[PDB]
């Protein structure tokens, strides 16, 4: 099929800072790869991102009652849904499954998989000596099923007997998870 | 501390397709299957703590449809640029032989959201146990999508996430194999 396509998008976004102390609501309308109108809770009304969205902004901002309910959506919609789901979204705590294995003898990788949230802290140690030279991380990978994974690689392989230690500090555990790797 | 909750909907023409879902820091909470008028929770545990009526999302798609047809005539029927997708094939965890895992096909940075995703095992399509998400939103207004093939890792099988998008010329095949 070679017919032209036309796409329309609509997003409502709630931003939480320090629990529910500061809440920012961002509603966006996207037509064909380009945002055209947006609502910002800080601004408190619709702003035309482009000239395509200009008629929408002058139209939606002219409805008083729906703007008040959209400003108040920090409480009735953002704060409410935060309390509804914080027991399984914010307070969700899934322990990382940490394992180590050497690729091919270098680039020692520490697999931090199946954890939540994504605020991970991976540090490499050489018998207590925190090695920061050869550390390379692939990044924070999102699996789409409320989990995360991350591979952190340490370039410098040691001599025999130098026990490298991958320490993982995650909000799900108070005592950091340490998985040690031995040498030749 | 920073947390984001997103409710994302879209409507597409002339395929006449729609969507409605909820997002938390880039992870989906629930979506509604308008054909069955049922609320589907991304994880089954989420239904025991909260409830959403799928009936209310019908009126949102009916507004998304009428919005798209107004924007089409306004832009002088300017077609969307068929941006080809970047496709990554991941796994849920480090893989081991004869130990269940989940192949993940991360289809990223594409528009419009029409993709013919097909899991191919040694060249033939597979639908046994195949799961998928909905078109997940993005900051750059492109789309993400996850397709899951619960599979038993082995060295005798190879897998392809054949992705067909109108921004390509031939089907996009991203390979995966063990070791």
């Amino acid at each position, epitope marked *: 099929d070679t017919r032209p396509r036309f796409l329309w998008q609509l997003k409502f976004e709630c931003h939480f800072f320090n629990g529910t102390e500061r809440v920012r609501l961002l509603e966006r309308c996207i037509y*064909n*790869q*380009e945002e055209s109108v947006r609502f910002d809770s800080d601004v408190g009304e619709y702003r035309a991102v*482009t000239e395509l969205g200009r008629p929408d902004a002058e139209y939606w901002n002219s409805q008083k009652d729906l703007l008040e309910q959209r400003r108040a959506a920090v409480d009735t919609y953002c704060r409410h849904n935060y309390g509804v789901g914080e027991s399984f979204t914010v307070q969700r705590r899934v322990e990382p499954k940490v394992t180590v294995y050497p690729s091919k003898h270098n680039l020692l990788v520490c697999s931090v998989s199946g954890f939540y949230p994504g605020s991970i802290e991976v540090r490499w140690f050489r018998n207590g000596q925190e090695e920061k030279a050869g550390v390379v991380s692939t990044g924070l990978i999102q699996n789409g099923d409320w989990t995360f994974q991350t591979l952190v690689m340490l370039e410098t392989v040691p001599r025999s007997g130098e026990v490298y230690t991958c320490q993982v500090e995650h909000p799900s555990v108070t005592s950091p998870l340490t998985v040690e790797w031995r040498a030749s | 501390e920073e947390h984001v909750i997103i409710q994302a909907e879209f409507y597409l023409n002339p395929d006449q397709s729609g969507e409605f879902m909820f997002d938390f820091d880039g992870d989906e909470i629930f979506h509604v299957d308008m054909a069955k008028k049922e609320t589907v929770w991304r994880l089954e545990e989420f239904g025991r703590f909260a409830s959403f009526e799928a009936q209310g999302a019908l009126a949102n798609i009916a507004v998304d449809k009428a919005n798209l047809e107004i924007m089409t005539k306004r*832009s*002088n029927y*300017t*077609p*969307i*640029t*068929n*941006v*080809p997708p*970047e496709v990554t094939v991941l796994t849920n965890s480090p893989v081991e032989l004869r130990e269940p895992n989940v192949l993940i096909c991360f289809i990223d940075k594409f528009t419009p959201p029409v993709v013919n995703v097909t899991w191919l095992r040694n060249g033939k399509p597979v639908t046994t146990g195949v799961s998928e998400t909905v078109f997940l939103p993005r900051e*750059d*207004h*492109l789309f993400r999508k996850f397709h899951y093939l619960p599979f038993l890792p082995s060295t005798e099988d190879v897998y392809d996430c054949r992705v067909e998008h109108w*921004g*390509l*010329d031939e089907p996009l095949l991203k390979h995966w194999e063990f070791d």
Partner: antibody
Amino acid sequence: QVQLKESGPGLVAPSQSLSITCTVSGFSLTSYGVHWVRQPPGKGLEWLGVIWAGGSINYNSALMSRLSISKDNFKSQVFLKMSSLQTDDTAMYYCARAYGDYVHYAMDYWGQGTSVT
Amino acid sequence: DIQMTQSPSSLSASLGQRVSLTCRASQEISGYLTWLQQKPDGTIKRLVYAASTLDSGVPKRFSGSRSGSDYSLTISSLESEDFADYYCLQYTNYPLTFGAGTKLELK
């Protein structure tokens, strides 16, 4: 982060052989393709060729029979060559990055530029 | 060979003013256009690709657009580092052809 760096000799005597090298960091060439562009001093840009992540190379018809593009994924560097030099080859030589193996993936990140006169 | 005609060759404007750079092709390019900026130092940076998709590390004052066969790059307000050279680029099919270019000058 993603960076591209062009290096090459600046002295180009007439009717000689030219070679330019582009070095990239922050990504892999097995997943991205490298374009080549040049710019005469004080004038516009001209696309020369491109090599994709799979290895397919597409040169320019006007400058074909002279251009040559190669790669080395392990060394993460790109190469350009232009035989039979002349006075209009005086320009700045650049490289850029594009994803995948198809022409509809746009180029994203540029280098700084090497000079020949 | 698709021929790109970048409408302005040189533009002079002060800071905080709206400017538009129009690029037109001789054929149908299916919206595959990339916009570029070249600062007087000589470095080149992408602003918009696919003719409407802003790049990640770009200020929100750069907008891409398409209307039939006429493409554009719009700067809503001009800062001090915006005065540079700009080149459009079509990539729908080989050979890739740039426009002649536009030089942005501080009036």
